[PDB]
Give the backbone structure.
Amino acid sequence: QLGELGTGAGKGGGGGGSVRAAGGSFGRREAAEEERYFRQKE
Amino acid sequence: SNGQITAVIGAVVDVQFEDQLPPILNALEVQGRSPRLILEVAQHLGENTVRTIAMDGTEGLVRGQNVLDTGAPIKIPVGPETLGRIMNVIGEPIDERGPIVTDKFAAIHADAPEFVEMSVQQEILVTGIKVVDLLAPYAKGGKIGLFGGAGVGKTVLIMELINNVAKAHGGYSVFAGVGERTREGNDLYHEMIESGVISLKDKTSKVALVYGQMNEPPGARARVALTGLTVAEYFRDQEGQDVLLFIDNIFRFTQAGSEVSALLGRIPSAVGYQPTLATDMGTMQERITTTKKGSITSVQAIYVPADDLTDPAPATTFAHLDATTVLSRAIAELGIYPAVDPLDSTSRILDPNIIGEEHYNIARGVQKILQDYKSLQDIIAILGMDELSEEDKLIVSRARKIQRFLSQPFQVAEVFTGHAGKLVPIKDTIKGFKMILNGELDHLPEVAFYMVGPIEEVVAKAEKIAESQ
Amino acid sequence: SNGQITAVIGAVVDVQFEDQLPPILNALEVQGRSPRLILEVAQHLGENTVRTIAMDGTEGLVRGQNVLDTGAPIKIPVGPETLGRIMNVIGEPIDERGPIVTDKFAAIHADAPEFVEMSVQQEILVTGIKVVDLLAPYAKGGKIGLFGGAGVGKTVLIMELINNVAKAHGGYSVFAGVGERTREGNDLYHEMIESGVISLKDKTSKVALVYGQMNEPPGARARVALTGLTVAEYFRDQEGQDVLLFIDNIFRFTQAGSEVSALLGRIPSAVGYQPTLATDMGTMQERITTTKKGSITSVQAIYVPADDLTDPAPATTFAHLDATTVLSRAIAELGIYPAVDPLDSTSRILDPNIIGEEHYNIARGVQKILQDYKSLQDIIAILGMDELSEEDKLIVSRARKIQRFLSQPFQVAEVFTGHAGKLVPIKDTIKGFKMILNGELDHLPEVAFYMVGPIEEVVAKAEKI
Amino acid sequence: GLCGAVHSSVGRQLKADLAANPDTMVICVGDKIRNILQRLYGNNLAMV
Amino acid sequence: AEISAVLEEKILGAAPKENLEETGRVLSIGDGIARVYGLKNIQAEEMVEFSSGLKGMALNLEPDNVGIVVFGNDKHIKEGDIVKRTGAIVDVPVGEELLGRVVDALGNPIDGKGPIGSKTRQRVGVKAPGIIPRVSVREPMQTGMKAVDSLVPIGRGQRELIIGDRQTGKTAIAIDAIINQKRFNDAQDEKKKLYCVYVAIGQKRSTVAQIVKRLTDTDAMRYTIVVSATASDAAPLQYLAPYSGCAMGEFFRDNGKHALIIYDDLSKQAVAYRQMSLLLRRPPGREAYPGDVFYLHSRLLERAAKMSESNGGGSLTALPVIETQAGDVSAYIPTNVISITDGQIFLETELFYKGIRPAINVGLSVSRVGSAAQTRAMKQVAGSMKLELAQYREVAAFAQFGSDLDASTQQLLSRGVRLTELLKQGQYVPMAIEDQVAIIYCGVRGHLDKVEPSKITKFEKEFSQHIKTSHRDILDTIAKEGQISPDTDAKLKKVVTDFLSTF
Amino acid sequence: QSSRMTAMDNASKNAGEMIDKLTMTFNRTRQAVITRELIEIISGASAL
Ligand SMILES: Nc1ncnc2c1ncn2[C@@H]1O[C@H](COP(=O)(O)OP(=O)(O)OP(=O)(O)O)[C@@H](O)[C@H]1O
Ligand SMILES: Nc1ncnc2c1ncn2[C@@H]1O[C@H](COP(=O)(O)OP(=O)(O)OP(=O)(O)O)[C@@H](O)[C@H]1O
Ligand SMILES: Nc1ncnc2c1ncn2[C@@H]1O[C@H](COP(=O)(O)OP(=O)(O)O)[C@@H](O)[C@H]1O
Ligand SMILES: [Mg+2]
Ligand SMILES: [Mg+2]
Ligand SMILES: [Mg+2]
């Protein structure tokens, strides 16, 4: 309900490449793997 | 001469004259009317009948009611007596501070300055906003457009530009509230009073406000932008001052023209609009310019309907602006404020020979990283972050650091968020983004770049995070 | 008085009168026609000329033909004499069984009952259909809509509702065939005389049939739903009965109104519809309600054009219904029948204080698993089943078992399917879905959950494999 | 990763070993097996 | 003006009597539009009366005829009927006599409870208050829902749009907001009382009867006016109903009191106004809507204002409802109302069927008043909640394919999951602001990390009962302080740990 | 490598099928937008 990252550009959560702009579940996958890598780094 | 009302259909009134007809764009006044309803002649229908648009509510009008021709277009008070005052579309004082006693009046319809009068001066106007100053820098005396949908931050950005520029400008400023909330007009009026830009006691007022809001009829909302522009034109021409013209929202000028165009007997254009959309916008916008007599720095908020930048009203407005900053909902949803799209906002003075080679190269370098970041996100979705090679690892990491660093707390948005407002010099913005592009801060976390003014606060926030954790 | 035909354009006839104009909605009778041609006054055009809508074909009409004013709207027979009979839009019997001899008549145009005459009580009407009884239960006395495209199954679903509800019903039924197949009207009529609901021998009939079908002119198709309402309104009001009203299908009322509106000289509305789409529908639908005098349980099949739920005619019909049952073509192409969309059907009685806590929690639990399945289906489509190991595969396995278990063989579909029809009590339905949600049947194959009513037939089918 | 159901099903078979030999130390070659199995049996991981 | 009788009497030079300046005759009648010859002294938007007793409003004034919309069924209107001027534009009764009453768009009671003894009548088309008479929105308007009063707060004097698809909970938000004002109307504080007005446009009469049944059972009817223009009513009645309800709420706003208006829904009022415009032969625009359909909603919602202390200090709060088609907010009418109102509450069908009820999309819901519409205790805990939900949004995606996570990240994921389950709330049970603050404070301070999310609701009831009859001194301490001191934070944490040990 | 090869082969075929269905949906939506916009212009022109 928070507009999860990768759910769509202008659809609550998203912004970026074509997959992130399209949203759905692949944008969720892109946001999940990216945030997991940068949380591991920090 | 004297005329009589023939038809009343919506905000369009047809009146018939017996003597010579009033010209187009003349102001007509209904006689048996208490709040001084004013009709503006739009077209001659033939058989001694002209068709008008009403500047106020049309309720209670009677066929046969006497209408008086003023012999001129809508004339509003202009001059220093309008500073610190609020005017409606027809120049009446709506701030309840008595009449506007002045000697100068100007018609709200005028010709644009000629090609001989054009000025080609282009110097960078520093606003303190890092994304604005770096990627799409504003020019002094140029036209600035704040594109965006609903809720993306056009109003907050134009309030921040008023706070950063109009408070310590030097020279008069004009705000034109065109078809927006009356609450926002009340909020801005009291913010100007508290800031000292409006003095209710002295004559040291700097800003003149003209307001036609959402409750106004389409005739008033389609002419109030010309009323604020007339005040700005008087300050530019008859005084030679440097004028700041803030307009919010300029889309309502176009929208109010489309509401009455069906009742004026016009076939609709594409999407649905007046067929005279580009011409009506062109005549209005080309009056807002820097003459050789004086300069008008214009900042216009532009509503983008349903976030569709290919809508005919935002699309026609793009060609009229030196600098355009597009506010994106996707940028705003990530938490980045201001929500300026870095790959959709352009400036005319973004040149190596205008802002310097270092400023241009860093700005192009930032936009290249952010564009490669968008290209790489599809590979991240499919291949994953595990298989990207260290080059694309540094591209993604520096892009997220750049994207977070474009955000900035606003002083006018402190009550919204709680973060203290920060003003950033252009030199600190160039140095800060150069450090991220060079890779000097690859060891810092990306959270340290979020909502911080300078790059020294990025280091301090990272040290605070490391010490606390 | 007496008028004369001025203009004939399709179903719209302009009649000019000399002395006194008939009011709007009055019925006019054309003189030189061997069958009865009825014109209904729609508007006054000026110069003592009215614009009317014909209830039959307008061929053979000449200009200047005499038109008689009946002085009243279209009055149709109402009462027990209409039970077991078939009548058209103007109340003429079309069953070839003689005239409908009655003393009671009623105009097909009536005002909707007022706000004072409203019943707020809601009780669940048990159907025997697992997807209906669980996710979007029907109210005993209320407006039920069956949204669906062409071929997804709405006539079959409404015939199953007649088979289940109307057979064991203490009251009267009314069927309004509105712009549908005349073959289906012949099939339903002989189904009634075979099931004993229509008695051709004595006066024990329990259903009144009103038929204006897709071969009728647009004037008849846009008014025959009002004739079925008027029969059902008499039973509710003048007798205090609990009435069943099956309308198949109510979209043809709106569609025929758009066809007439093109000839009425109106500026067309969105998607070419009439400007008065919502007002004409609202006037018709507000008359179909349960009052304090009596109750009407209405089931209305609703055709959607081009499988579009955003079309103005289905979209405005959504707000008129207590329970909606949206039938999907994608579900029907999966072989799941009835093809009810679980995430698009609502009931307005899906409340813990109305249907119970366990019924509500199972229905919300089913919808949560199916919504999670729809979110995961994009990963399943492109990448595949390799996702989250145990967790998401368990979600997919349970949701596919639920989707199979929502399907059910119908007794009215038994002719062309071979599977015997199942009537499932609602206690067995909520018990069956609770077993799937609890994970008690994860080891069973999902083929065992398909096209079997009770959950005991699921485990019996699994043992058979 | 993202080669299909390789690391997931192998880890699932390893989970079945954790339900059969809970006191057996496991030497893993790959981080994906470590990621899946650390939450369940981090006390019975020799080296990864 | 060339009709056969008028043309013929012009040839004869008859100079006819029955002069048509305060009266007229119908030329054409059809589809609720009457074209009337005469009425020379008539005004624009003026009420008229037909010879059958029906009322009408003159919208199109033309040299030949007058275009009049009909307030009811046009079967009574006939060509040649006499139309008389009322003399005034449309007005409705106003006052506190309408509290507890169900009325139509013209103010006539439809609940059968007798005549309304109103003393004053206001015209429905008054002009909105200007810049000077209104002050900034500062008083909280308590919806009673945790997801609204924390993330999308509503202040007294603010237009807040409730937008979503069909059957997403838009009426549920509005009715629960009306029910929540029972607490303040029972109290002795006159400043915090709110008189709700519910406007039902184009609904069923059984739906409105179910609304009145719900409001009477919860005893919310004593301060609620229900203006009802259902689907059976004429399109002019459904068009006029928001302005009638606004005028009834403007009586409270102009008399120092605070009122709340719900337009349920404004999308149907646009449909009714589109029908009148098309049948008045006005040229259509996008989706056949007239050009003035934006000015239709803008001149309505702008009358919702928070007046200054020199104008009595009263407020008018508007909650318009807009229905979208499959989530398409790019349509003509949803785009207009979004640009008018001060905020949106987006409701999604996907969130509705995932268990999230109310189905508020936090990423799409905005509020332009911000923390100024929240009390001091709520602002302290909603700011920390908004940060934690932002941090949870960053780390909520790890459940897709992640398997090993950091301990701090796992704590953020666990706390955010508790917060998402905290924002869920049942229907018809609005909770008080002190209960919302206390539960949210426990959610964001880690007091629920040891509790399974399935038992959050049971904790929300039982623990609130424990700190109600036993630790009411702490509640008085927070009420007098207005915020959460570190000593009070430690005391509440000790009660939580004591209760969880007993749990 | 065999599993990753057949997973990408299935993904490319499924993406290819989804491209074809989205292309037909795009063509239907493009044609519907052109037709709907022109009908709105015609209705505005005819109502004058
Ligand atoms: N419950 C069912 N069980 C099995 N098959 C079914 C069922 N419902 C529908 N069908 C299939 O779909 C076909 C369409 O049936 P039906 O006439 O009910 O559809 P409809 O929606 O009324 O379509 P139309 O628009 O043609 O009236 C049936 O002939 C049958 O093949
Ligand atoms: N928070 C909630 N918890 C549980 N059920 C809810 C909640 N909110 C709404 N509902 C239920 O969801 C259904 C639809 O909600 P509601 O009728 O309020 O939505 P709506 O948008 O007004 O619908 P419509 O389009 O019919 O007007 C109702 O049965 C209502 O009881
Ligand atoms: N600079 C900013 N910082 C934080 N939030 C912002 C900022 N700009 C806009 N917002 C958000 O947007 C809302 C106001 O948007 P607004 O500027 O009124 O949009 P518009 O210009 O389209 O009217 C506020 O509630 C705030 O949450
Ligand atoms: Mg704005
Ligand atoms: Mg059918
Ligand atoms: Mg509702």
Notes: Chain E touches chain D through three residues (CB under 8 Å). The radius of gyration of chain E is 27 Å.
